[PDB]
Swiss-Prot record:
It comes from the Bacteria. This is UPF0301 protein ACIAD0353. It holds the Pfam family DUF179. Belongs to the UPF0301 (AlgH) family. Coiled coil: none annotated. SUPFAM superfamilies: VC0467-like. PANTHER family: UNCHARACTERIZED PROTEIN YQGE, UPF0301 PROTEIN YQGE.
Amino acid sequence: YLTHRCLIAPPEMADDFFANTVIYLARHDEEGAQGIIINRPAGIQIKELLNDLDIDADNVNPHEVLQGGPLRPEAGFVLHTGQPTWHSSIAVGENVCITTSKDILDAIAHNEGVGRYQIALGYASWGKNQLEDEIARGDWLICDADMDLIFNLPYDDRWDAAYKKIGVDRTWLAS
């Protein structure tokens, strides 16, 4: 399936919500697919989010909180590296995990044991065969995920980078 891959909104996509997005696919099986947009900050600082979740974080390092999708804006997801060592954690792909337990939030609050990360509120979901049908009719572009797209690159440069990455192993004129 397409787990660990990134969906890229084509430049011509008219969808008001998904236009200009890069979506990391966390899960994709026979029942559907679920993803997290990785290039759209919500305009919320990590300290604000932690405090709202009743977690002290007076010394937490500044970090953006992402809008992961249009569904369940209450649900938080932390993307990070290493093994799924936390209480509720799953390995998605090459050294990348998604954790929904609160233990990792305490780690983030104290600036330790987390490393590079993204925390997103909300997610994107597709029903059975839905994503496959959309891809079939050319609704999405696709590229492999990597550390730059998920963690290193500035959020506002991720769509361009993903769009360009398509051309690393195939003839692709990004223009």
